[PDB]
Design a binder for this molecule. Structure first.
Ligand SMILES: *[C@@H]1O[C@H](CO)[C@@H](O)[C@H](O)[C@H]1NC(C)=O
Ligand SMILES: *[C@@H]1O[C@H](CO)[C@@H](O)[C@H](O)[C@H]1NC(C)=O
Ligand SMILES: *[C@@H]1O[C@H](CO)[C@@H](O)[C@H](O)[C@H]1NC(C)=O
Ligand SMILES: *[C@@H]1O[C@H](CO)[C@@H](O)[C@H](O)[C@H]1NC(C)=O
Ligand SMILES: *[C@@H]1O[C@H](CO)[C@@H](O)[C@H](O)[C@H]1NC(C)=O
Ligand SMILES: *[C@@H]1O[C@H](CO)[C@@H](O)[C@H](O)[C@H]1NC(C)=O
Ligand SMILES: [Zn+2]
Lengths: 194, 597
């Protein structure tokens, strides 16, 4: 059984980073070497593991988290990072064991006039725990007066859009990110293969 | 949460929303200026109206946070600039009246036509009709006709509108707690709350007048030399001790004396340096011109142009059907989008303009990391000064020889040096008394020091005394000759061209010292000097985040505008002018007039 990595990397539409998508990978053979030898390749940084010697050991479960951010925010998909993405949308733990994969998707996720499909969380009462997801749409109360569920003074909708246009700079162009988490619990191996 | 914390969250929301709406308006504006259509005018207006409505709404919300309770200055700067009322402090009726006055004056200026006598159909506009006369004609009567007809038929239309324009602008400024509309304009240079770097609005008047006193000796000898040369060309029209007739100065107003070069060139047998033929001989195109300009900034340590710059800019005339506004402009659309719009020709002028416009781009890219409201020059004169010094280095023989456009065998003697400096002074020095005197007149009108029944009387008393220029025809108070210039009838402050001129030579002198340049300042090329580029970049990345006095100190080491670098640049000409005027009268009498007889 070959691991369904094509459904994750080659998806027609990616999720918004605030509602990042997770695909659990189990009971299959993953040629982590066949995914590294692709055309569209940019960021491929692994933590706690080695990409040269990937498909050599065994894991209990492999999680694939996919979303879209702008170019200048790919740096935040790393342990011990701060910013709107790392604090309010997608947070990696300090002891993260996995790989972060990203590539430019300006040809797919941009549109003349603006592609407003992808959102991100701009405000939140506190930072996210590692691998926490917040899809709430509660009006953020910046002041002391209650917001009553509508935007107003010191009351902002917490989600903001990117509006990707193909004429943006690289730092503002959309990037599709895939985060591979490698779990090793007290269970027999389920995912490994050359 | 404190008020300052709410303002930080408010500005956080504003930045992300302003960047999106500003980009859509800039993109729609770009599509029209590169593709002048009817559909693009509407899309430019629709996107522009949404951006202006967003600013008006955010300005009202910004005025809900009291500035006194904010202590972080970078936050106070952004709130202050967003809290600026402007015309929105007046009643809806008075703001509607003012905007109608502004549109009518702009329409009168851009559509004002003058028809030749005995032919009511052979009419000329200012551009290009009258401007061509005032720039090329040597006939005294033809220039007098263009100068007078423009002011008697278009200027007289602007006189009643300008009177009501002053009243409403002063009501707007005094409602914003300014002394008058001139004091409101001088607020661009105001700095408060930074010990050692503060600057008051009234201090600008004192610094402009103080530095201008030091310019007078150079200008008087430039004025005396020009008068003597023009007196040889028009012996019966020019007095050896009088002012220069206003219609014999090179353009419609004498704003620049550039076009007087043919009649005032010191050594008219040595040709100028024109590398245009060498560019055509080497099959240069527009991309080569901007590639060389890109190499210039890279040589001093600045980054290359973005990939989007080469892909999205319009560096050549689209030609044929697709029309475009060919005025050279540098565009900062935000979100990493930087473009240059220019219908570049293979000439030396466009070669220098490319370095000038790309200087604006380097400025925009340097402060792109600043917050949205702080992405601009330190003050109104910084951006244009940065662009000017790029063409200074790029035009030198030392630079043109290093890029293969000027022959190495070509040698430079002191006669070609004087010719170059005189050409520069006609443009740069000749405009300083014009700029200062024009803005002083507007400052005094807004301040109430000049009654309405003495507007034109005081305008020409100050032209004679300060500028050494006399009107060729007596003008009563039905005229409004100041409004006959674009900036006056289009509501633009003018002192920016005075401060920018002094800034650019302070910049150039400092960068050339960092480049270890030896010899006269005007022969300097900062190319290959990463020390000069680093010293300039330390100011460029500041944007508007720091006081302009501190931003200026990063480059030149001084906290204030200084005229000495300007005089250092022109000293070889100043000594040559003083020797030429040894048997001429230096200075001018103010009572002589070409119509006195
Ligand atoms: C310019 O506008 C015309 C009018 O519709 C259109 O045919 C043309 O494709 C446009 N060109 C560009 C470059 O947008
Ligand atoms: C001012 O606020 C900005 C954020 O808006 C912060 O980065 C900066 O450190 C603050 N400066 C001071 C002096 O508090
Ligand atoms: C601007 O005018 C508004 C009312 O239109 C007022 O609330 C605000 O205090 C004014 N601000 C200044 C700086 O004059
Ligand atoms: C700028 O130059 C560097 C080499 O110094 C190059 O790697 C980079 O791609 C260039 N940038 C662009 C936008 O061409
Ligand atoms: C700058 O350096 C380049 C080589 O890097 C050289 O070709 C050029 O002549 C130099 N120009 C000056 C003014 O030193
Ligand atoms: C130029 O220099 C020569 C000596 O090298 C001198 O005789 C001549 O007068 C100078 N001319 C000017 C205009 O400075
Ligand atoms: Zn410019």
């Amino acid at each position: 059984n070959l691991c369904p990595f094509d459904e994750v990397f080659n998806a027609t539409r990616f999720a918004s980073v605030y509602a990042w998508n997770r695909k659990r990978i189990s009971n299959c053979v993953a040629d982590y070497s066949v995914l590294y030898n692709f055309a569209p390749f940019f960021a491929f940084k692994c933590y706690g593991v080695s990409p040269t010697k990937l498909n050599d050991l065994c894991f209990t479960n492999v999680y694939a988290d996919s979303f879209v951010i702008r170019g200048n925010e790919v740096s935040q998909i790393a342990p011990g990072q701060t910013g709107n993405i790392a604090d309010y949308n997608y947070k990696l733990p300090d002891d993260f064991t996995g790989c972060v994969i990203a590539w430019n998707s300006n040809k797919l996720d941009s549109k003349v006039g603006g592609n407003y499909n992808y959102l991100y969380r701009l405000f939140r009462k506190s930072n996210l725990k590692p691998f926490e997801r917040d899809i709430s749409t509660e009006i953020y109360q910046a002041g002391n007066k209650p917001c009553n569920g509508v935007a107003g003074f010191n009351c902002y909708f917490p989600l903001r859009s990117y509006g990707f246009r193909p004429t943006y700079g690289v730092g503002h162009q959309p990037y599709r990110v895939v985060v591979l988490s490698f779990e090793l619990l007290h269970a027999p191996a389920t995912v490994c293969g050359p | 949460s404190t008020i300052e914390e709410q303002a930080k969250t408010f500005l956080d929301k504003f930045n992300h929303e302003a960047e999106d709406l500003f980009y859509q308006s800039s993109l729609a504006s770009w599509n029209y200026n590169t593709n002048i259509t009817e559909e693009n005018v509407q899309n430019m207006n629709n996107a522009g109206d949404k951006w202006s409505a967003f600013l008006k709404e955010q300005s009202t919300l910004a005025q809900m946070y009291p500035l006194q309770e904010i202590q972080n200055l970078t936050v106070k700067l952004q709130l202050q600039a967003l809290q600026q009322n402007g015309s929105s402090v007046l009643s809806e009726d008075k703001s509607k009246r003012l905007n109608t006055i502004l549109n009518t004056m702009s329409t009168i200026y851009s559509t004002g036509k003058v028809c030749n006598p005995d032919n009511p159909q052979e009419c000329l506009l200012l551009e290009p009709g009258l401007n061509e006369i005032m720039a090329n004609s040597l006939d005294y009567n033809e220039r007098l006709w263009a100068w007078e007809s423009w002011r008697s038929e278009v200027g007289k239309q602007l006189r009643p509108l300008y009177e009501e324009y002053v009243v409403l602008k002063n009501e707007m400024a005094r409602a914003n707690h300014y002394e008058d509309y001139g004091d409101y304009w001088r607020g661009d240079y105001e700095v408060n709350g930074v010990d050692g770097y503060d600057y008051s609005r009234g201090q600008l008047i004192e610094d402009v007048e103080h530095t201008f006193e030091e310019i007078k000796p150079l200008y008087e000898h430039l004025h005396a030399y020009v008068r003597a040369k023009l007196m040889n060309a028009y012996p019966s029209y020019i007095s050896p001790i009088g002012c220069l007739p206003a219609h014999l100065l090179g353009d419609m107003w004498g704003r620049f004396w550039t076009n007087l070069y043919s009649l005032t060139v010191p050594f008219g047998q040595k040709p100028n340096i024109d590398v245009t033929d060498a560019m055509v001989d080497q099959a240069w195109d527009a991309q080569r011109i901007f590639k060389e300009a890109e190499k210039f900034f890279v040589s001093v340590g600045l980054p290359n142009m973005t990939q989007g710059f080469w892909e999205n800019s319009m560096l050549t005339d689209p030609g044929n059907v697709q029309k475009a506004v060919c005025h050279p402009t540098a565009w900062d659309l935000g979100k990493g989008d930087f473009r240059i719009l220019m219908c570049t020709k293979v000439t030396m002028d466009d070669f220098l303009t490319a370095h000038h416009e790309m200087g604006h781009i380097q400025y925009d890219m340097a402060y792109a990391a600043q917050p949205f409201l702080l992405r601009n020059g330190a003050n109104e004169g910084f951006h244009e000064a940065v662009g000017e010094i790029m063409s200074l280095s790029a035009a030198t023989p030392k630079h043109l020889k290093s890029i293969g456009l000027l022959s190495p065998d070509f040698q430079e003697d002191n006669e070609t040096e004087i010719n170059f400096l005189l050409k520069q002074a006609l443009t740069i020095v000749g405009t300083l008394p014009f700029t200062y005197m024009l803005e002083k007149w507007r400052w005094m009108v807004f301040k109430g020091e000049i009654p309405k029944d003495q507007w034109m009387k005081k305008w020409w008393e100050m032209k004679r005394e300060i500028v050494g220029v006399v009107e060729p025809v007596p003008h009563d108070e039905t005229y409004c000759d100041p409004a006959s210039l674009f900036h006056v009838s289009n509501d633009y402050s003018f002192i920016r061209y005075y401060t920018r001129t002094l800034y650019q030579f302070q910049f150039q002198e400092a960068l050339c010292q960092a480049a270890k340049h030896e010899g006269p300042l005007h022969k300097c090329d900062i190319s290959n000097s990463t020390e000069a580029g680093q010293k300039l970049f330390n100011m460029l990345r500041l944007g508007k985040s720091e006081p302009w006095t501190l931003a200026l100190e990063n480059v030149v080491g001084a906290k204030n505008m200084n005229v000495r670098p300007l005089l250092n640049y022109f000293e070889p000409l100043f000594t040559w002018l003083k020797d030429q005027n040894k048997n001429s009268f230096v200075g001018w009498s103010t009572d002589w007039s070409p119509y006195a007889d």
